[PDB]
Amino acid sequence: GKLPVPWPTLVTTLVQCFSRYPDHMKRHDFFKSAMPEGYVQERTISFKDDGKYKTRAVVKFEGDTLVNRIELKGTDFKEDGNILGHKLEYNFNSDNVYITADKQKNGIKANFTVRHNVEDGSVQLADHYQQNTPIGDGPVLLPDNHYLSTQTVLSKDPNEKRDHMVLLEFVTAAGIASQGEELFTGVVPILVELDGDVNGHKFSVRGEGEGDATIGKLTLKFISTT
Numbered sequence: 216g217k218l219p220v221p222w223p224t225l226v227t228t229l230v231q232c233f234s235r236y237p238d239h240m241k242r243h244d245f246f247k248s249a250m251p252e253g254y255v256q257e258r259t260i261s262f263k264d265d266g267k268y269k270t271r272a273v274v275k276f277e278g279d280t281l282v283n284r285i286e287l288k289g290t291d292f293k294e295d296g297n298i299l300g301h302k303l304e305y306n307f308n309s310d311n312v313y314i315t316a317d318k319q320k321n322g323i324k325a326n327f328t329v330r331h332n333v334e335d336g337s338v339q340l341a342d343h344y345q346q347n348t349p350i351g352d353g354p355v356l357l358p359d360n361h362y363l364s365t366q367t368v369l370s371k372d373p374n375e376k377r378d379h380m381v382l383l384e385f386v387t388a389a390g391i392a393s394q395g396e397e398l399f400t401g402v403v404p405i406l407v408e409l410d411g412d413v414n415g416h417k418f419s420v421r422g423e424g425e426g427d428a429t430i431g432k433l434t435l436k437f438i439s440t441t
Contacts, residue, residue, distance in 0.1 A: 235431025266292030289413030
């Protein structure tokens with residue numbers, strides 16, 4: 216059925232291993248280096264003057280497919296706020312995702328603030344705190360400070376009667392090698408599964424598509440499977 220939250224608020228939660236790291240930066244690609252065993256990605260997303268998502272994801276290869284399986288828990292939302300009230304525009308502005316190394320966890324942390332456009336012309340901030348920790352015991356690449364530059368387009372499939380989101384995304388690393396890296400030289404099929412609960416409103420999302428890390432490109436279609 217219809218999602219209890221706006222599709223744009225789920226974009227960041229629904230595979231940064233598909234970021235394009237330019238050659239001079241390839242030694243800073245933590246995401247690919249953790250593959251195939253993958254990493255756990257955790258976030259707290261604080262919607263200012265509203266509630267928060269807390270997410271925990273396992274991102275890894277199953278066979279030939281890059282899988283992202285997420286549990287999302289949302290609390291302290293306003294039933295009439297921009298999120299539960301569906302007052303957000305259907306688009307997604309560019310972000311710079313600022314990444315830092317977390318040596319103690321042998322992983323990374325990331326911070327950025329998403330600006331969601333509200334339909335009355337105001338803005339809804341979604342402040343992201345992120346931490347990624349490798350699942351495997353093998354050597355990973357711990358990066359110098361840098362960031363990921365994103366561009367995203369949201370659309371619809373005219374032949375789809377289910378609540379859904381067609382997403383196109385490009386991400387390049389900027390602001391400044393592993394076996395895992397070689398798993399991404401071609402086009403890679405992706406599966407995304409999210410189980411969500413926001414203020415007790417339960418929902419599920421499944422996404423299918425593919426990633427081309429050579430150009431930093433994501434093409435996915437997401438469907439509410441509630």
